[PDB]
Amino acid sequence: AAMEELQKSIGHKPEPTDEEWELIKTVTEAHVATNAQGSHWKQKQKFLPDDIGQKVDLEAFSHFTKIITPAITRVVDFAKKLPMFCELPCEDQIILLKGCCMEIMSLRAAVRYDPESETLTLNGEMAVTRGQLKNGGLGVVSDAIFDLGMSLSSFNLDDTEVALLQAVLLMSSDRPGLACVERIEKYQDSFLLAFEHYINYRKHHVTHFWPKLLMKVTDLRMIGACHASRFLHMKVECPTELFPPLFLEVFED
Ligand SMILES: O=C(O)Cc1cc(I)c(Oc2ccc(O)c(I)c2)c(I)c1
Ligand SMILES: [As]
Ligand SMILES: [As]
């Protein structure tokens, strides 16, 4: 219990326990496996026509929702590759995924922010600008993600960190309706821990790194909630036909 609480008070910044490494291995695997087209510096993006997205620019909105079912599936793939997840009742596995889906999606899109072209890359293919994503039906949610991506520039995260982060967003035991609420906090904490340890081991040269990286979990949660509201404004504004099936089931909450 306090082998940590004490080891801390001393000043020791504990690396990950042999077992935690196994857990980190699992999560970094599952992430990279359910990821985009790879992930590197210098060319790949398919810059979205500049005349797209400039109410709701239905032209853009289409492009997005077009490649939205793939993204939503990779999130479910990731969650599938985490044993702890599988250990949960199908009911809960659905409440969890529907909750953290946009959160993990905003994260992935945010960590693909290119400061040069000032664009994110959705599904690792389509590049979009702030106003393109904004006018394509996300509104102020675009500024949220773009502002995040810019901020995450400095944390210079890696797959494992972005992989763990997603696991923390996933085991949010506060989702309404959860049945096995305890067994979920146990797993999230298990993660937050292997996560904190991994950050010590990596030792970034940023003061208060961890406290700052947890403040991101909150911002991601806020992008999530803000999206739910934007989904309403989208239902009413855009048609009822341009809404992929999966996309729809996942977001009626
Ligand atoms: O990049 C990835 O893998 C994940 C990802 C994929 C997409 I498409 C995306 O844009 C959205 C999401 C919801 C929505 O209602 C609309 I309109 C656009 C974002 I932000 C992130
Ligand atoms: As909002
Ligand atoms: As906001």
Side-chain angles (χ1 to χ4, degrees), residues 9 20 60 92 104 108 145 155 165 169 196-197 248 250:
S9 68
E20 288 180 318
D92 296 354
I104 285 162
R108 301 192 158 181
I145 295 155
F155 300 50
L165 203 35
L169 284 163
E196 189 186 294
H197 292 187
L248 291 181
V250 163

Side-chain angles (χ1 to χ4, degrees), residues 49-54 56-65 67-109:
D50 196 58
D51 44 282
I52 304 294
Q54 307 176 303
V56 90
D57 173 75
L58 291 129
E59 203 167 309
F61 179 90
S62 186
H63 284 103
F64 301 159
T65 44
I67 56 173
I68 239 295
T69 313
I72 303 184
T73 37
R74 348 199 65 58
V75 168
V76 189
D77 296 323
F78 167 66
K80 275 199 299 230
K81 295 205 268 284
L82 307 177
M84 284 170 262
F85 187 59
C86 305
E87 275 261 288
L88 299 169
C90 111
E91 305 70 48
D92 296 354
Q93 316 192 314
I94 301 155
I95 272 57
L96 252 55
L97 275 170
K98 300 193 54 176
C100 81
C101 202
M102 178 59 180
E103 300 178 353
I104 285 162
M105 274 193 253
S106 313
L107 172 54
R108 301 192 158 181

Side-chain angles (χ1 to χ4, degrees), residues 160-176:
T160 289
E161 305 167 312
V162 175
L164 288 153
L165 203 35
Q166 298 181 175
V168 174
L169 284 163
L170 171 52
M171 299 300 157
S172 313
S173 64
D174 59 292
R175 306 292 183 199

Side-chain angles (χ1 to χ4, degrees), residues 16 20-28 30-32 78 82 84 100 104 107-108 157-172 187-202 204 209-210 213-214 217 220-221:
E20 288 180 318
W21 283 94
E22 247 194 285
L23 176 52
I24 284 178
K25 169 206 81 295
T26 300
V27 188
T28 324
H31 167 45
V32 180
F78 167 66
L82 307 177
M84 284 170 262
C100 81
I104 285 162
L107 172 54
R108 301 192 158 181
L157 300 183
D158 74 14
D159 299 338
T160 289
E161 305 167 312
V162 175
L164 288 153
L165 203 35
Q166 298 181 175
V168 174
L169 284 163
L170 171 52
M171 299 300 157
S172 313
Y187 299 176
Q188 189 177 49
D189 293 330
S190 158
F191 275 108
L192 282 161
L193 222 108
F195 194 5
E196 189 186 294
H197 292 187
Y198 186 82
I199 289 182
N200 290 326
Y201 162 84
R202 284 252 296 168
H204 297 257
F209 200 71
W210 185 244
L213 210 59
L214 291 176
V217 171
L220 284 175
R221 291 210 179 301

Side-chain angles (χ1 to χ4, degrees), residues 140-141 144 222-223 226:
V140 78
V141 164
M222 289 304 302
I223 272 89
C226 229

